[PDB]
Amino acid sequence: DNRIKTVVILGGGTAGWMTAAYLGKALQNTVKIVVLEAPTIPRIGVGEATVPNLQRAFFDYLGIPEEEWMRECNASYKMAVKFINWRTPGEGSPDPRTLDDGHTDTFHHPFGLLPSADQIPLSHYWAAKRLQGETDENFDEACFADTAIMNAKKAPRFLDMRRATNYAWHFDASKVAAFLRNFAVTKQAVEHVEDEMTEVLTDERGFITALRTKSGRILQGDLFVDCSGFRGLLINKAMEEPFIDMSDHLLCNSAVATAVPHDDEKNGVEPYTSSIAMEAGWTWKIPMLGRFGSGHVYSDHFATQDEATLAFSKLWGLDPDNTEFNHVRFRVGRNRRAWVRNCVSVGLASCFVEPLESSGIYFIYAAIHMLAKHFPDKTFDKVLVDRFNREIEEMFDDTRDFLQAHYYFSPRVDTPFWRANKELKLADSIKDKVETYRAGLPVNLPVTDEGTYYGNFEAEFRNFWTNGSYYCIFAGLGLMPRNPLPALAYKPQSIAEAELLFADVKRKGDTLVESLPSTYDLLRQLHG
Amino acid sequence: DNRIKTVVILGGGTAGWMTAAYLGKALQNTVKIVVLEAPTIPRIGVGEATVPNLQRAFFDYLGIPEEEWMRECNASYKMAVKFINWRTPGEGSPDPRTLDDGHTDTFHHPFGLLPSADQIPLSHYWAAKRLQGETDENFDEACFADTAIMNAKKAPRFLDMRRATNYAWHFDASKVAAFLRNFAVTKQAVEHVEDEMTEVLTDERGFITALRTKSGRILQGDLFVDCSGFRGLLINKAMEEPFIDMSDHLLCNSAVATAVPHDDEKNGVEPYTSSIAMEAGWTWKIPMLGRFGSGHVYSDHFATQDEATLAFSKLWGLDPDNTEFNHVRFRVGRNRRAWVRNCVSVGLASCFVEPLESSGIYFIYAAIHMLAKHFPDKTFDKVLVDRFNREIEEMFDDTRDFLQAHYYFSPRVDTPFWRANKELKLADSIKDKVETYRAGLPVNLPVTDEGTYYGNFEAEFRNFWTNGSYYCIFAGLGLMPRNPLPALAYKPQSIAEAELLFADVKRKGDTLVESLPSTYDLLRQLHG
Numbered sequence A, B: 001d002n003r004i005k006t007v008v009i010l011g012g013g014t015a016g017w018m019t020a021a022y023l024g025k026a027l028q029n030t031v032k033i034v035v036l037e038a039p040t041i042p043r044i045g046v047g048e049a050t051v052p053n054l055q056r057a058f059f060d061y062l063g064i065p066e067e068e069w070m071r072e073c074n075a076s077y078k079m080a081v082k083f084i085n086w087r088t089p090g091e092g093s094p095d096p097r098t099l100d101d102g103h104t105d106t107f108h109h110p111f112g113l114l115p116s117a118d119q120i121p122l123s124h125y126w127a128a129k130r131l132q133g134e135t136d137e138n139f140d141e142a143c144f145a146d147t148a149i150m151n152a153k154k155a156p157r158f159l160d161m162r163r164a165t166n167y168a169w170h171f172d173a174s175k176v177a178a179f180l181r182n183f184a185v186t187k188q189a190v191e192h193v194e195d196e197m198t199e200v201l202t203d204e205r206g207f208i209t210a211l212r213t214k215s216g217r218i219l220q221g222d223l224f225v226d227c228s229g230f231r232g233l234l235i236n237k238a239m240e241e242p243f244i245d246m247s248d249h250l251l252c253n254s255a256v257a258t259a260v261p262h263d264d265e266k267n268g269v270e271p272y273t274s275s276i277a278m279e280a281g282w283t284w285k286i287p288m289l290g291r292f293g294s295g296h297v298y299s300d301h302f303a304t305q306d307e308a309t310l311a312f313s314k315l316w317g318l319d320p321d322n323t324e325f326n327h328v329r330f331r332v333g334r335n336r337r338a339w340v341r342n343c344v345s346v347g348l349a350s351c352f353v354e355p356l357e358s359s360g361i362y363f364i365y366a367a368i369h370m371l372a373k374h375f376p377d378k379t380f381d382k383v384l385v386d387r388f389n390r391e392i393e394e395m396f397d398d399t400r401d402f403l404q405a406h407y408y409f410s411p412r413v414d415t416p417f418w419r420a421n422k423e424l425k426l427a428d429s430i431k432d433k434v435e436t437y438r439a440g441l442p443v444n445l446p447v448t449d450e451g452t453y454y455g456n457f458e459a460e461f462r463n464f465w466t467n468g469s470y471y472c473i474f475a476g477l478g479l480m481p482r483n484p485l486p487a488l489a490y491k492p493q494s495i496a497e498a499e500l501l502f503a504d505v506k507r508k509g510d511t512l513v514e515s516l517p518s519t520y521d522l523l524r525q526l527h528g
């Protein structure tokens, strides 16, 4: 019997308890699972956003109904991230400015896959009309019925819970962690050790054999998961694996955040996350029931902590001297290798980007999903470890490049921060994708229906940022192809076929805006 | 109007008339299409095999029912390629020898995608049982119900044409070309010019402006498709694009072929292609109604034309002095670029490998599919051409490496030909896949169901050789993983779940072997 017998997870939070809960199910109680979590003072919940696969790939895998965990974490609904004022110059404001053509400086990044006509996505039929002056609708409103629903703040489900569109979730991360802790301990025989780690003991081959606790207890294990956050107490300190700083791709490195009370009955609840551009970064708005979390992501090379806190306070009209703020300084990049010997890093201990596109929880699940697939025995095959590392670094580098495109193609040049983003270098892969986009060709064309895409995680993992997403960001920022897809000039029947698709997007949005309940009303029914 | 107005296709055959027919539909009669086809003396039909996507991706796209074109080409059914005597030394024989461990020296490479249990393919559950001595079944019979159906020579459809399994087609290529020629000329307004080309006329930049015919007529065009075969009259001769010879991966370069009358009533008809290993190569067997096509692929560095012809005749008991033979000398490799300026190469003019895995028609369709997707205007955007060439060279190199693995991992070393294959080196990409396979991990894991896979060509093109195919060849030739997938040691419930999957494969095979008609009986009904 050369199997792993004990897995020790260092650190709690979402990363530690998602790992414990998932491995408890995946290893079918053949392995003892221990979580060593230092007790900490509970901070205010600033909000976390997710992607649609979380319910199908994670909670359904654990047998946890969607409504059950939503009620224990004050969860809300998310249909997109909404970018505000990323093209017009000026101070930070929650109200969108006006573009040169009179349109409001907002664009959406919704979920789902675009329909096709003659194997060509709807985005390309829109671009042909837009480039020729035959339409004045923006991409998101022409190709997504979700845009009309979000503008009316309607819910993604009816009152009888029939689905209307794809959606993800907003929640308090600390309440989700507490929920999974109770689940894993009572229903999955996970042992919770409330103590601090003081020393990491390694053998002659450099493998971790045990952790010492502050109380003197020794925790022996065979496989160790580092969920200790940015400190990387196992992967970086003990294993000495270098962290690859990637600040030459993304300049932001700091954040100030808080939670703001919100009158839901008066103003309603927005079924989306807002990305509000600032002078030295941007500010998120993650609405929940009764309050929304908000945080200003900024670069300390272009704004001091006080400057960022004042601009953040002025955004929501807060008293900086009588408001509870949280200040964070984070590292941007990834470890050279996520898995070294018998130490697997998950979450912030592995890699991190600014939450511009809700990568945090997704990065955690994708790692624990790949860990179960590549789970070793006590021999720790180098090929298993290498293939795991390969999937993690490709996943991260791909999303990193996607985020850099947000800053590089923003037309703003009014402050040194926005000017400095144009001096950074694009990765070769994102340069290649832009070149393809500018020719009128699709980028990362979806090959599956939405059922396969969101029902099988491996299908989405091989194509996370699809053609629709690149059009949302590129066209949203004003970057258009040089010309329409040249094949469309020979396909008049296909162009007419897509006109029916455009009419369906208008028809679906208008019908649903009438019949769907408000997000506020669905939340009251859910949390009632 | 900067559009292409006229497309001139040099050469007929399957490549020329698949291009003409397909572009006739894709360009929606906005472009005049001309085929310049030299009249040639009809050779005996040696047989061609295909892949399952041909009906959905090509004939259904043209609106041609399956039974209609099958009846005009004496088409038969193909459920796999069956490799015979690729693991044992000796003279060429149609009868399989016996391995040292008692197994018969045959293995199949069927179509379809393997089921999975706990997101793990059935191949990995088979490998675990085989490596632990808990089963003696071969991979193909344990994971494919088609293997039992093929062993009984049953048809892939019932007599009322209800589908029973996946399948492809055997046919006469010249009759398919004649069928498509008649379709394109009568139903699609394609102009057929029966003449030889004498001159290629170019402008100052090297773009083709017209072709002159032997009769003196000049055919002007804007885009030219080279379907002239191995000579590459446009892409290689006129445009001077170099051909990348890849004989350092595949040694075969010649073929002798014929058609053999067959007593279908006595012996039945095999619903598969046979690859019969020889002393200096291999021989195909493509059964049709009343006859089978056969061809000995060999290397002339290890067998003269007479030596190969005698061994080929001895295989089927033919009189070499009273038999009609076709002799061909082919090049193995691809052009440096498939599309140069306004010249697109399709078929043998573009690239070629031996038909060990039915690459011919698939290579043609993939090129014409990608040409319609990247179809240009008269400016010929460099990015369109580059993306097309990128898809062609990756498609080819991937199949090239897959074919070399057949020879590289064959345990035969008995003749100078088989020993010479062991001196070649594997490409880095296939070395990586072997390393992954040997650790027990899946290689090119399928992420879609069979409906999406065979219904959307882009899904299959991004994953043509899936995990099932690599197991068919590696395990069929005796290359096994070093150990089972380590995660299986922690998943006893998943092992039990796959045991039900194995039971379903047995149940389907046994039930269908009883109720299905013979392939001979379905063909008699189809061609009646």
Ligand SMILES: N[C@@H](Cc1c[nH]c2cc(Br)ccc12)C(=O)O
Pocket: A200, A201, A202, A203, A209
């Ligand atoms: N030499 C170990 C500490 C240690 C002391 N006794 C041990 C015994 C075992 Br088994 C493993 C490690 C240690 C280190 O430097 O981490």
Ligand SMILES: N[C@@H](Cc1c[nH]c2cc(Br)ccc12)C(=O)O
Pocket: A201, A209, A210, A218, A220
């Ligand atoms: N019991 C440990 C080995 C061990 C023996 N003495 C130890 C002392 C320390 Br401190 C840590 C580990 C060990 C194992 O089986 O992995």
Ligand SMILES: N[C@@H](Cc1c[nH]c2cc(Br)ccc12)C(=O)O
Pocket: A051, A052, A053, A080, A081, A109, A110, A111, A112, A356, A357, A358, A460, A463, A464, A465, A466, A469
């Ligand atoms: N694979 C992602 C792609 C995506 C589309 N819109 C998004 C918006 C955010 Br914020 C994050 C991811 C996506 C999904 O559809 O869930």
Ligand SMILES: N[C@@H](Cc1c[nH]c2cc(Br)ccc12)C(=O)O
Pocket: B051, B052, B053, B080, B081, B109, B110, B111, B112, B356, B357, B358, B460, B463, B464, B465, B466, B469
């Ligand atoms: N994409 C191919 C893969 C394949 C499986 N078995 C085959 C057998 C031959 Br011969 C050629 C291709 C395949 C298909 O499923 O049709």
Ligand SMILES: N[C@@H](Cc1c[nH]c2cc(Br)ccc12)C(=O)O
Pocket: B413, B419, B420, B422, B423
């Ligand atoms: N002919 C060379 C090259 C070679 C490498 N590996 C081989 C394996 C076989 Br079997 C035959 C030849 C080679 C040799 O005898 O070493």
